[PDB]
Design a protein around this ligand. Structure first.
Ligand SMILES: O=C(NCC1=[SH]CCC1)N1CCN(C(=O)c2ccco2)CC1
Length: 119
């Protein structure tokens, strides 16, 4: 029932994501010389270094907020991809599945801890 445990759990999962080759494109921002229309399509860029920095700054209050930002990485990739068979989009879907598999217990444990706190 540790209300703070999610933060280290999210740090560890971000570490695992950074060790994944599939996270390569999503570790930093997109170069507009490489992808000059990217901000015409994507309103709110997001990447895993921004998520990690936000977490380490103490600027997430809950793992739900972190989860929303990570899901934005993946929805941006789906919005920007010209093809559902693109290399970078395909990397996003594997990484998304890995993320969702691991974040589910983090969310469940946090929400259970908050409920116990308010019992
Ligand atoms: O250039 C980057 N990231 C920087 C990189 S790529 C390798 C290392 C660092 N992008 C490309 C556009 N993005 C997509 O989601 C996408 C879907 C289809 C094609 O691109 C986001 C990631």
């Amino acid at each position: 029932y540790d209300i703070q445990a999610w933060k280290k759990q999210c740090e560890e999962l971000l570490n695992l994501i950074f060790q994944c080759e599939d996270s390569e494109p999503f570790r930093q921002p997109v170069d507009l010389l490489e992808y000059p229309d990217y901000r015409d399509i994507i309103d709110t860029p997001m990447d895993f270094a921004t998520v990690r920095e936000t977490l380490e700054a103490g600027n997430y209050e809950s793992p739900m907020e972190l989860c929303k930002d990570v899901r934005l990485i993946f929805s941006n990739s789906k919005a920007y991809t010209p093809s559902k068979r693109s290399r970078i989009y395909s990397m996003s879907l594997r990484l998304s599945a890995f993320f969702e598999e691991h974040i589910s217990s983090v969310l469940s444990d946090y929400k259970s801890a908050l409920r116990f706190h308010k019992r």
